Amino acid sequence: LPPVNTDIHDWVKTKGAWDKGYKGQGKVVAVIDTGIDPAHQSMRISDVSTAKVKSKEDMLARQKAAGINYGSWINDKVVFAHNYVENSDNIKENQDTKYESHGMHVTGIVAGNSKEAAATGERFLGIAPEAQVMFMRVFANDVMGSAESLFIKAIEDAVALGADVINLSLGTANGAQLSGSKPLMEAIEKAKKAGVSVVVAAGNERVYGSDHDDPLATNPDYGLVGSPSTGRTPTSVAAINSKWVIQRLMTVEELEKRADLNHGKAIYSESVDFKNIKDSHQFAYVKESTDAGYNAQDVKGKIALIERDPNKTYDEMIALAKKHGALGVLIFNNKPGQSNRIPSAFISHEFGKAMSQLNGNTGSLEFDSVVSKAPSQKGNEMNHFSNWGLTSDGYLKPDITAPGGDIYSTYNDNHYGSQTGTSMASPQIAGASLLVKQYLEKTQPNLPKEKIADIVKNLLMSNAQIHVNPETKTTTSPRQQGAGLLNIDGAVTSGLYVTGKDNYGSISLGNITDTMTFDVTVHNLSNKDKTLRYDTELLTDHVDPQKGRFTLTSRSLKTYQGGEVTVPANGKVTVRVTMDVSQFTKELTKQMPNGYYLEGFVRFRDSQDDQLNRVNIPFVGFKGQFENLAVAEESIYRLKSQGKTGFYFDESGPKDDIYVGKHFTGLVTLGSETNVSTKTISDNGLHTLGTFKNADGKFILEKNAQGNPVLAISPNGDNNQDFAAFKGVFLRKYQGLKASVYHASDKEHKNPLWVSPESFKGDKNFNSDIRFAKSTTLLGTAFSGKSLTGAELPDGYYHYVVSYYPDVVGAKRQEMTFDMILDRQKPVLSQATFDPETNRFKPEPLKDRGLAGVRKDSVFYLERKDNKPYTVTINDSYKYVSVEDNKTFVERQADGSFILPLDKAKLGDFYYMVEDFAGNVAIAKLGDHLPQTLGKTPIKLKLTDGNYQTKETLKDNLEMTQSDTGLVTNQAQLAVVHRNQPQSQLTKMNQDFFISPNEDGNKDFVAFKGLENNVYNDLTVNVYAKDDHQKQTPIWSSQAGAGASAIESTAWYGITARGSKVMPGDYQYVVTYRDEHGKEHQKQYTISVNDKKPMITQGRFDTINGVDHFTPDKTKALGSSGIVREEVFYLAKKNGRKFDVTEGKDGITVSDNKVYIPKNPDGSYTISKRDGVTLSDYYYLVEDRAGNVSFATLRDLKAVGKDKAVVNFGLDLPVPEDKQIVNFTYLVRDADGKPIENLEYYNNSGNSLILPYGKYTVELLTYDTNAAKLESDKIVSFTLSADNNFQQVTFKMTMLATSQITAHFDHLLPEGSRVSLKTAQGQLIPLEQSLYVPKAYGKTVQEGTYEVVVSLPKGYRIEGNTKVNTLPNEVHELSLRLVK
Ligand SMILES: [Ca+2]
Ligand SMILES: [Ca+2]
Ligand SMILES: [Ca+2]
Ligand SMILES: [Cl-]
């Protein structure tokens, strides 16, 4: 037999358990992952009668009557396999980089058992080579709502089929331990109680900031360690790099004598473009000194090249090579570490640095093939990416380390390969957990299956070897390490483990003051006894003082020592540790002002002659208050007012540029230009509030005469800065977030005038790579100068207050306040002086009406081009038209005047414009109020604003007659190609009282219009809910000052007073007013609100006189979704596009080049073939009673053959289509239960299938199980046929809403208090003490109504408001006061 590779086995000390009789034998590991190739030579058991599952037949006996009839035993080794996405039995993936498979690799690492040699000549075995493997193919892609469904199945199926150990590989960054994802936790917890060890990789995100910079020393909460592994039950696995690596190295035969360089290894660089074997047998190395040009006439050409000097990586000190020839190049570090390095490639790789200088012979060179085991350049170091820090709620995770870096394991088709990550360290602890269970299953069968897996964890952890950072000769932080490195031997032999106060092999202490005090308990498992001597190291983060950022390492403070203990036999012994750290406080809190970690280990050696019975337990606490670290970064406004900057803020380009795409905390608003020659038809997008377009169009944060910026919005209707909304850079995970507005005289923020209707939660912005956002904008925090009742809040000075909480159960609410001006008033245009001889135009000094200041005045004329004063510009690629003025600007003299080049345009045609900080702009056209008798001598010129900036009004042509209902709404066509806003106009509404409040232009609101010579005094509109049958409590009311005219004052947009869309359903719209004489009048109407785009059937197509005829299926007219318009049209091509601009009286409007086809008497439409118009330019379109519109090309309505049918699946949620789940997956099965293959989709919806006629079922597979829950049948059956050739299937669901509840107390509670939430219906939700705020008891809960009950001992009471009616996404604090 060939030799065994022990690179990872020597190091984890695994052979110590094999030789004691513990291979994988008689156990089985469930590997939930991406794929296997159960045929691989490694996939084998030695003796099949030693095994848990004994044959293909012991399986079906275990499948059935445990309750499962999918997926099969495949061989003795891979004992169960099922592909839980798509519900199939294709298990192997993937059908250079070929053959690679993640789940194959994972299994290779946990179970054995190759008796053939890999590329090195060695046999590779897993940590438990004699275990059988069930493998669940489960992996996510976000077309679904949530993969949790599929994981829980795989888990439950694992526990029921053959239990033992599950290896998960799954993670969501910065998880919590307590408020994890409930249905997945319970499934994990269920497995523990069945004796299953659940081990989970901890993540590859490393720490907050990891793809940007090291975290600032003010922000200690940089933990990225993932759920579900952050849970208390599972085993969270950090990853250390392998000391030995297996690659395709290099060899310089001339350096074979040099023995610190492996005799030619250098590994390889090869980044981005991996063209190592482009031009690479080889020869002809070179030698280059400087990275300049022609250093010494080069000397390359068909020869590799050599340099550093970090001047310009990958471009100037890379592409400069192919210049002097050389057919390839070779870089070396400028220190000993081997970093990573458009492409601009000939051939290039990075190779060591100690081997750079050793290349000092020119020389010859070869690029090795096959794999040759070489020493890792990252050796005994913690892998860069292994997750760290605490859980989101402040718990010590990970739990243990194991080799994750450059781990050699199994690939498909008898191949092997190296892949790196915490995903790989986890199967090391998977196998190790197999073995330590055999051990306890032999050592104590007097041990229950419910306490078993918690101890396998505790043995592995206490017996771990505390890692020491090589580059720094300091212990690596337990927040990065766990309880240490995996010591398999130590775990199965020592029979000692350690718990702390919490009864866990780790200790999280919460905050700490000056005296760290905690009880440690050592446990004995054998009959013989041990007497051990203990001492504790005490560590904190090291921070670099040049830049003020952590260095992701530690420094030792003082090793305090305690003494010796003597554990009993089959017994415990407690110990008390105590340390005064009051000493180190000044030095540390000066380096880390918001607090620091005080962590470390306590070690246990055998008293006489240590190294026998070496065991440890880790601890961490926080000096400060971990509950109250700042959740958000400070606003870019405050930071820049001081000299500071943001963690992700790019200060590139002009001073004080805050481009809106730039990752800060701040306020965002919408911009819209102001045009004097034509109507503005589109807006300019978001920009940062208080920034303004400077000369070169960069957005600068401009300052008022006192040196401050101004946050001001103008909630007029003009779309220039009408709202403000919060954008955040989050440091910690957030909860409870809302925006509130108070008047600024209300200094304590006790009377909200406006609150954002929703409250928000989310993740820290940890930016671990490009896929992870550095800022998040929450547009649902938009404030628009309206109150909680819809009233306009008057111009003035207000506070916009964004408040939130962290995810720690006792934390106190953090606020963050923005000074905010509402100012809706244009600045003043009075007068100026112009001098025909000097031509100097001087306006009065600049005044504003309102609190926002004047921000800039300008003079401009309209540079006519191609006979028009504006420039209409058509974006062909994005099907968009924009049009703005040709403003050319007159420079402004330092004295505040302009010289007006009257050669370029007349005097009448200059405009003076003054704009303010809130977006109001005044523009006077000089020609207004200018005497025609000019050109003589100084004048006083009157200026008035010309209302160029104004809110647009709907075209209103309507003449009301008595017969008219009085209701009006709007009308618009739905664009098919162009992405401009289709022009809309007012229409009567005397039937079909249905609205689609979707702001598309068409039936969006219900207004009321009165007869023109009738009087409507005190006209108000109130909308009542269907339930409110006495019409007592409006849900929306018109604002004050409404009449028959200004229909906008009566327009109801399907919303509540607070601005949120109402639910689908029907509502009483009541118009009330007083008379000509004095009589009261009340018209009442039933308005019905409905979104939901129509569903378009296939129709059919027949050929008639050699021309295509399309006949649509008969539209149904009943209901709100009944169809009331029906069009077939095509799009003509004019000027080479399918839309068109037309310049009208009003302004410019954009339209599709629609040509309609009449209906024929046989209900068909004749589809002529005409020059340049194909079937993809013919459309069917339908409008419902509500104004909802759908359309499809006629090309898409074919590909439904005349013998085939269509089924469409969708979810029916009782909410507005903008607050709905849309993501789910489904399996369709044919008459025999076989899944359908070879899917054709219909009208471009992945939810609509073309299928042959027959009987079928569909199964709702996955949906967002946290967002919504299913209420209708999960499996629905349907039959397709020529009569029923279109089938709707609908999964009916309800929305889920959660809230957090915290009971905060006066004083601590006596021992023996049991806090619980009492639900209506009487049940008890037990609560537990907060770790950081021990007078707090909190939980996240379903939106409902609860009471806090405590049940104290021997006599005390609680005395406070204990009842709360919970709101969705709110945090409710119920402070409570115990007394005696
Ligand atoms: Ca974390
Ligand atoms: Ca405005
Ligand atoms: Ca609409
Ligand atoms: Cl103003």
Domain range summary for the chain, segments of one domain joined by +? 9-242+382-623, 249-369, 636-822, 831-942, 967-1088, 1100-1293, 1298-1375
CA distance 1261 to 1225: 5
Six-digit token pair at 597?
């970690």
CA of 205 to the centre of ligand 1 (A): 9
Lookup: tokens for 852: 């926002």
Distance from the alpha carbon of residue 172 to the mean position of ligand 1, in angstroms: 9
How far apart (Å, rounded) are the C-alpha atoms in residues 302 and 314? 20
Give dist(CA 498, CA 109) in Å, integer. Answer: 28
3-state DSSP percent of the chain in helix, strand and coil, to 5: 10, 35, 55
Task: Give helix 182-192 / helix 148-161 axis angle, nearest 10°.
Answer: 10
> Which tokens is 330 given?
């070779």
**515 Cα to the center of ligand 1, angstroms:** 28
Given in angstroms, what resolution was this structure solved at?
Answer: 2.8
User: Parallel, antiparallel, or unpaired: how do β-strands 235-241 and 400-405 relate?
Assistant: parallel
Residue indicated by tokens 């060695």: 122
Q: Rounded CA gap, 1121 and 252, in Å?
A: 77
Lookup result for tokens 């599709």: 1152
For residues 1094 and 1075, give the distance between their C-alpha atoms in angstroms, rounded to a whole number.
43
Write the DSSP string, 1102-1116: EEETTEEEEEPPPPP
Residue 72 near residue 88 (C-beta atoms within 8 A): no
Output the CA–CA distances (angstroms, integers) from residue 1258 to 1221, 1241, 1289, 1291, 1298, in the order listed.
19, 15, 8, 10, 30
Distance 814 CA to ligand 1 centre (A): 21
Pairing of strands 1245-1252, 1204-1212: antiparallel
Domains 967-1088 and 1298-1375 share a fold: yes
Give catalytic residue positions: 33, 102, 423
- Name the experimental technique: X-ray
**CATH architecture label of 967-1088:** Sandwich (2.60)
* Token duo for residue 352: 């060591």
User: Which CATH superfamily hosts domain 9-242+382-623?
Assistant: Peptidase S8/S53 domain (3.40.50.200)
DSSP E strand boundaries for 1095-1201: 1100-1104, 1107-1111, 1123-1131, 1139-1143, 1148-1152, 1154-1156, 1165-1167, 1178-1184, 1189-1193
* Contact call for residues 516 and 579 (beta carbons, < 8 A): yes
Q: Half-sphere exposure (CA, 13 Å, Cβ side) for 644?
A: 16
Structural tokens at position 568: 């009993």
Alpha-carbon distance of 814 to 732, in angstroms, equals 12
CA distance 1159 to 1110: 10
Strand pairing category for 1107-1111 and 841-843: unpaired
Q: Which ligand is nearest to the CA of 807?
A: 1
| Distance (Å) from CA 157 to ligand 4 centroid | 67
1247: nearest Cα among 1264, 1230, 1231, 1261: 1261
Task: Name which of 1244, 1249, 1261, 1236 is nearest 1287 in CA terms.
Answer: 1249
For the record, the structure tokens of 827 come out as 């600045």
Dist CA 831 CA 844 (whole Å): 6
Which amino acid is present at 890? V
Residue 1192 and residue 1180 in contact, taking contact as beta carbons nearer than 8 Å: yes
Task: Report CA(444)–ligand 2 centroid distance (Å).
Answer: 77
Rounded to the nearest angstrom, the distance between the alpha carbon of 719 and the centre of ligand 2 is 6
682 CA from centroid of ligand 3 (Å): 19
Question: Angle between the 422-443 and 102-110 helix axes, to the nearest 10 degrees?
Answer: 30
Strand partners, 1048: none
From CA 647, how far away is CA 661, in angstroms rounded? 15
Which ligand is closest to the CA of 1054, given by its number?
3
Sorted by sequence, the CB contacts under 8 Å of residue 776 that are 6+ apart come out as: 727, 728, 730, 762, 765
Smallest CA-to-CA distance from 1117 within 1282, 1286, 994 is with 994
Binding-site residues for Ca(2+), please?
223, 225, 235, 625, 627, 714, 716, 718, 720, 722, 743, 746, 823, 825, 848-849, 915-916, 996, 998, 1000, 1002, 1004, 1304, 1343
Determine contact, residues 83/90, Cβ cutoff 8 Å: yes
- DSSP label at residue 56: H
How many residues are present in the chain?
1380
Closest listed ligand to the CA of 828 = 4
User: How distant, in Å, are the alpha carbons of 451, 874, 1269, 1277 from that of 1273?
Assistant: 39, 50, 12, 10
Cβ atoms of residues 438 and 277 within 8 Å: no
Residue from 361, 357, 329, 325 nearest 343 by CA: 329
> Which H or E run contains 639?
helix 636-641
Tokens describing residue 1072: 């009330």
CA-to-CA separations, 1266 to 181, 1271, 1298, 1340, in angstroms, rounded = 8, 14, 9, 13
* CB atoms inside a 10 Å sphere around CB 1188: 24
What is the Å distance from ligand 3's center to 1000 Cα? 5
CA of 992 to the centre of ligand 2 (A): 35
Q: What CATH fold (topology level) applies to the domain 249-369?
A: Glucose Oxidase; domain 1 (3.50.30)
Helix (H, G, I), strand (E, B) or coil at 425: helix
* Phi, psi angle pair for 107, to nearest 5°: -65, -45
What distance in Å separates the CA atoms of residue 203 and residue 559, rounded to the nearest whole number? 31
Residues annotated in a binding site: 223, 225, 235, 625, 627, 714, 716, 718, 720, 722, 743, 746, 823, 825, 848-849, 915-916, 996, 998, 1000, 1002, 1004, 1304, 1343
Ligand 4 (ion): residues with CB under 5 Å are 823, 825, 848, 850, 852, 916, 920
- Give the ligand at the shortest distance from the Cα of 849: 4
Query: How far apart, in whole angstroms, are the C-alpha atoms of residue 745 and residue 133?
Result: 69
Task: Tell me, in angstroms, the distance from the centre of ligand 2 to residue 995's CA.
Answer: 28
Amino acid code (one letter) for 1165: Y
CA of 209 to the centre of ligand 1 (A): 12
Tokens matching residue 1266? 């946290």
Read off the amino acid at residue 561.
Answer: Q
C-alpha closest to that of 718 among 667, 785, 790:
785
What CATH architecture is 831-942? Sandwich (2.60)
Smallest-distance ligand from the CA of 996: 3
**DSSP one-letter code for 465:** B
Euclidean distance between CA atoms 85 and 90, whole angstroms: 10
Q: For the chain, give me the number of helices (H) and strands (E)?
A: 15, 81
Are residues 1206 and 1096 in contact, defined by beta-carbon separation less than 8 angstroms?
no
Ligand closest to the CA atom of residue 221: 1
For domain 1298-1375, give its CATH number from 3.20.20.70, 2.60.40.1120, 3.40.50.1820, 3.40.50.300. Answer: 2.60.40.1120
Looking at residue 1054, what DSSP letter applies? S
Distance CA 1221, CA 1211 (A): 8
Distance from chain centroid for Cα 1296? 20
| DSSP string computed for 707-743 | S----EE--SSSSSS--BEEEE-BSS-EEEEEEEEEE
The amino acid sitting at 434 is L
Alpha helices in 28-73 (DSSP H): 56-63
Residue type, 727: K
Q: Can you tell me which residue has the tokens 């990252």?
A: 378
3-state DSSP assignment of residue 823 = coil
DSSP 1227: E
Nearest ligand, measured from the Cα of 914: 4
